[PDB]
């Protein structure tokens with residue numbers, strides 16, 4: 001095993017709420033040079049080998065990464081940084097070898113800070129070696145995620161590495177309403193549902209907690225033997241997810 005391999009992920013840009021601007025930057029960074037690498041050679045600019053997504057948990061970094069891979073017909077391989085801390089230089093190598101074999105590939109490195117906090121450590125040094133190894137205009141791209149871009153060893157941020165940075169922030173009020181709608185699409189909801197009030201009531205929620213709200217709302221409707229989900233069900237679901245946060 002070692003790291004998640006997904007032959008072709010079934011996630012699209014329509015599954016992502018809000019994030020239009022940051023999704024566009026990532027598409028311009030990875031999708032454009034994959035679909036039309038010849039343009040980047042004509043103009044004489046090396047596209048980025050690594051894109052670092054940063055921001056708080058559950059705001060859709062992983063989503064975006066899977067969605068890119070889908071659009072561009074690539075394999076998606078995921079490693080978790082905290083799992084790479086024990087060996088593991090060997091594992092980073094096997095990762096990039098496989099990724100080349102199953103190319104086109106999108107490598108997603110979660111929690112990169114676990115490995116690259118600031119003659120460097122042996123696992124981190126493999127990541128550096130592997131990225132200097134493969135060339136841009138090539139068809140293996142790396143995407144990394146972290147809370148703390150400030151705590152990263154500046155060696156990761158040097159040219160030819162993760163020299164393209166995108167902030168993936170908490171959803172704004174409009175985004176939150178989209179996120180709830182998106183995760184309610186498979187589920188019959190009343191016409192009388194006020195998505196925008198629900199969005200006002202979820203100040204500081206992330207995408208994962210908004211999805212969880214949809215899930216509890218659906219579960220409350222079930223326990224009540226309803227055949228559709230009511231506004232008051234979403235309001236109780238918000239209240240439940242807020243309770244769980246408090247129970248870290």
Ligand SMILES: Nc1ncnc2c1ncn2[C@@H]1O[C@H](COP(=O)(O)OP(=O)(O)OP(=O)(O)O)[C@@H](O)[C@H]1O
Pocket residue numbers: 015016017018019056057058059060061062063064110111145171179182206207208209211
């Ligand atoms: N903008 C969004 N639109 C739709 N769903 C979202 C969004 N953000 C988060 N979610 C939901 O929450 C779940 C977790 O999100 P995701 O794993 O992408 O967050 P993250 O930024 O990768 O956090 P981390 O990598 O630190 O765990 C996803 O499965 C997704 O379904």
